[PDB]
């Protein structure tokens, strides 16, 4: 019994309804009249949360904006009046027979207005320096869409060697995206230069939001 869902939903406007499809290779409708399909939610950095079970029973705590309908083989999770906090990955699954099987999950995409990244660069801490290490960090927070590049310039030169980037999931309250960029290097190398620039080229303005020290 394989359950299949798409990896991403179409972008949804806050306040409007979202639909998440799911399909099973076998009918989940049991002779007792119950359809053994359940949905759970996985938010950024939290434990899975049951949403709906037996096709149309809400789990306590789950607001009635959530609902599920479908035949025995094709189902739809519906979320009306989508709120920013609804972001996350929705999984369908079946508990009709062994072995238990699960969908691959559908990430709810929330659409919103373009936003610029609030950049903030930081030089190696004194502590890290006393330990011989020297990493320069700069954040590019609360931007939209999640598309961006980031570029480092050491003393006016392009350095992409020891750079590591990390992106967060869509914010559950802001619907924006944030990213972290860290250029790690030896203290000896760090002192070998004086200027460090953090460049953030977002798909807006055409002009990069640079920051350096």
């Amino acid at each position: 019994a394989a359950l299949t869902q798409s990896p991403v939903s179409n972008p949804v406007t806050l306040g409007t309804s979202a639909s998440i499809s799911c399909r099973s290779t076998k009918s989940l409708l049991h002779s007792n009249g119950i359809t053994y399909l359940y949905w759970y939610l996985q938010k950024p950095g939290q434990s899975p949360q049951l949403l709906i079970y037996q096709m149309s029973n809400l789990a306590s705590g789950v607001p009635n904006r959530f609902s599920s309908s479908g035949s025995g083989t094709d189902f739809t999770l519906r979320i009306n009046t989508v709120e920013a906090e609804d972001v996350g990955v929705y999984y369908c699954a079946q508990n009709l027979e062994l072995p238990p099987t699960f969908g691959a999950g559908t990430k709810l995409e929330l659409k919103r207005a373009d936003a610029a990244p609030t950049v903030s660069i930081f030089p190696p801490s004194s502590e890290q320096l006393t330990s011989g290490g020297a990493s320069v960090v700069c954040f590019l927070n609360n931007f939209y869409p999640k598309d961006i590049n980031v570029k480092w310039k050491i003393d006016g030169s392009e350095r992409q060697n020891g750079v590591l980037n990390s992106w967060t999931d869509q914010d559950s309250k802001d619907s924006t995206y944030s990213m972290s960029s860290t250029l790690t290097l030896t203290k000896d190398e760090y002192e070998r230069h004086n200027g460090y620039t953090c460049e953030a080229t977002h798909k807006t303005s055409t002009s990069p939001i640079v920051k350096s020290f």
């Binding site: 950095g45 999984y91 699960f102 999950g105 954040f139 927070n141 990390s166 967060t168 920051k211």
Partner: protein, 208 residues
Amino acid sequence: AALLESGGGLVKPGGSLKLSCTASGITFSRYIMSWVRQIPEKRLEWVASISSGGITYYPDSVAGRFTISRDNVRNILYLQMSSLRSEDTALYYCARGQGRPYWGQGTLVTVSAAKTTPPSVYPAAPGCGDTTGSSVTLGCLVKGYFPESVTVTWNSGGSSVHTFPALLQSGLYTMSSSVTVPSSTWPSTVTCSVAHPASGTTVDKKLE
């Protein structure tokens, strides 16, 4: 009604570990109890099930290495793991899947050879010559730790927090966390609290 997994931890390849699960409001002996697991990559993986009649089911992936059992009197569910493999690393859940599914908070099982290490916390504060004042961006850099499971807290009251996923570098994990507040309150002590149980460590650094 609550299910509580326990017994997870760091174990060397080829090693063995026994997970247990207690419950409140659920009588294990009456259902098909199961164990499932999820690798951070996401998507649950069935690990084992045991029927009310005591029949055990296992997918090929663990077929002869894992043993699910149940103590009907003490109402405890067990998962005896052996010949542990790297691919077994994950968060393991105890679950009553029939009807309304119930599962625990989960227990982490790390199959590695690497030595566990506490995290090095470095404060990220505005240096000399930077746009500050109206809302400033502060943060803490956490690098040099192993058991990934690590949590950062800012005064226990943050809404403008941004915890970035940890990236593995040279065997060690590194993650950062940023916060933002107006300068009007800036001189009111900002402190980040990094917890890392797998090391029994908790580091706190007040920025500037």
